[PDB]
Amino acid sequence: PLLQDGPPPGGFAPVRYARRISNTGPSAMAMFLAVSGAFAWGMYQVGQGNKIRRALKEEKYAA
């Protein structure tokens, strides 16, 4: 009917098929450092909290 379906003038837009990689998230030693520093600081905080709890328990016993 002289109105066949087809691409528009100039063709269609170019497409990608080459598996783009986002590469999201922390990389290399970032996670290791963030975990080791957290572990050390948390252990220091735990020691301080245990000292506070020991003081509380010893004052309870002194009562």
Partner: protein, 96 residues
């Protein structure tokens, strides 16, 4: 006036530990030497009378600020760190 129950004694132990020290030391030394209740009888009344006098004095001097402390200590089963509010309200008026 207050009966020497568990709550009042635990609450006022802070004041007992600075005014009943010589009598308590004497009673502890007497008990260490001999476990006889009969032999520790005479020293077992000095501490009782001094503690009762301290409780009377605290009740008269710190009346309203001690009843709430005892009530909350009884409520929370003698746990100091939980409330502590009536606690500092108590040593605010009683100078210990």
């Amino acid at each position: 006036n207050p009966i020497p129950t568990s709550a009042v004694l635990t609450a006022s132990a802070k004041h007992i530990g600075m005014r009943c020290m010589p009598e308590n030391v004497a009673f502890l030394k007497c008990k260490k030497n001999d476990p006889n209740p009969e032999k520790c009888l005479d020293k077992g009344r000095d501490v009782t009378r001094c503690v009762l006098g301290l409780l009377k004095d605290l009740h008269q001097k710190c009346q309203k600020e001690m009843d709430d402390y005892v009530g909350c200590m009884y409520y929370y089963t003698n746990e100091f760190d939980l409330c502590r509010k009536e606690q500092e309200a108590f040593e605010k008026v009683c100078p210990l």
